[PDB]
Amino acid sequence: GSHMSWVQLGSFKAAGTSGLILKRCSEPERYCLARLMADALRGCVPAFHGVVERDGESYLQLQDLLDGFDGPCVLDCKMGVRTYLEEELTKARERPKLRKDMYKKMLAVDPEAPTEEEHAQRAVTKPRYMQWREGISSSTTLGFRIEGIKKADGSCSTDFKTTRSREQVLRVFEEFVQGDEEVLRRYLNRLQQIRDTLEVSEFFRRHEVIGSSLLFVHDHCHRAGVWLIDFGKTTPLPDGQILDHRRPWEEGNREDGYLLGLDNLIGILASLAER
């Protein structure tokens, strides 16, 4: 029905207009959503209606993706082999900010993961933490990871930090769709059409897409949709330079593995459909 309904039961606020939601404005994301409304990917992203002022702060006015659903189930999938900008590697070499928060979450999952010096510091750099997170999840090997589920029973979970194997990922989607063959068929048709759109998009060949998600939404009436969201770390390549979005990332090449991820995700859902 609406996201703010679920919120009530960080960057999001309720809109006055029915079927809309407000997200805190960031300049990279505003730039991206403006370009996307004129791109092949227009129908694969939430409608962007412009910027509004609320309590002396700027908000993006977005389509509420939950509006058309009756008690929506939601799964957020972070896309890419890399989840941080290359500039973070330069900042950590020249002038590191030590993160005590990030050391604690590391310790919790694997006490043996931090180095002798990190244990002494009780702190790690951002790129070190994010690379570790990529390696214990499916990010490094499959090019995507499950971040969270919000269920129609009001229950939610973010307990997926060690979901890594192809079969572990398949079991999360198996539980999410609860044997609804129509929802799974509609998700697979939508992902195939999104892949075709990405492969011809003028926006996609010219931009590094880091930290974006695919948002899966379905309901008990068998309605099913998928959209790209979160363009806060999506940046244009210099000159007339393009990415293939499949080849491995090496510092300098700005590759994101986005389509390696989408290829693997379609393969897993196609496998699940034949079980």
Ligand X SMILES: Nc1ncnc2c1ncn2[C@@H]1O[C@H](COP(=O)(O)OP(=O)(O)OP(=O)(O)O)[C@@H](O)[C@H]1O
Regarding 10 and contact with ligand X (CB under 6 A), the answer is: yes
**Residues pairing with 99 in the sheet:** 124
42: DSSP letter: G
114 is in an annotated binding site: no
- Single out the residue of 65, 146, 149, 262 in contact with ligand X (rule: CB under 6 A): 65
Ramachandran angles phi, psi of 172, nearest 5°: -70, -45
- Single out the residue of 42, 163, 232, 246 in contact with ligand 69I (rule: CB under 6 A): 232
Q: How far apart are CA 142 and CA 197, in angstroms?
A: 21
Find the DSSP H helices in the chain: 3-8, 27-36, 87-94, 100-109, 116-121, 126-136, 139-142, 166-177, 181-200, 202-206, 258-273
230 is in an annotated binding site: yes
- Single out the residue of 44, 183, 210, 215 in contact with ligand X (rule: CB under 6 A): 215
* Stretch of 39-47, 89-97, 224-232, 254-262 lying at the interface with Mn ion (CB under 5 A): 224-232
C-alpha separations of 73 from 58, 152, 154, 192, 258 in Å: 29, 5, 9, 21, 24
Contacts of residue 55, defined as CB under 8 A and 6 or more positions apart, other chains included, come to: none
Task: Between 204 and 231, name the residue whose CB sits nearer to ligand 69I.
Answer: 231
Task: Between 3 and 245, name the residue whose CB sits nearer to ligand X.
Answer: 3
Regarding 29 and contact with Mn ion (CB under 5 A), the answer is: no
* Stretch of 5-13, 94-102, 109-117, 191-199 lying at the interface with ligand X (CB under 6 A): 5-13
Regarding 68 and contact with ligand X (CB under 6 A), the answer is: no
- Single out the residue of 3, 35, 126, 145 in contact with ligand 69I (rule: CB under 6 A): 126
Residues counted in the chain: 275
Regarding 133 and contact with ligand 69I (CB under 6 A), the answer is: yes
Q: Which three-class secondary structure state does DSSP give residue 43?
A: helix
Task: Between 15 and 106, name the residue whose CB sits nearer to ligand X.
Answer: 15
CB of 251 to Mn ion, least distance (A): 23
Q: Which helix (H) or strand (E) holds 216?
A: strand 213-218
Judged by the rule CB under 6 A, the positions of this chain that interact with ligand 69I are 126, 133, 211, 232-233
Contacts to ligand X by CB under 6 A: 3, 10-12, 21, 46, 62-66, 74, 76, 213, 215, 229-230, 232
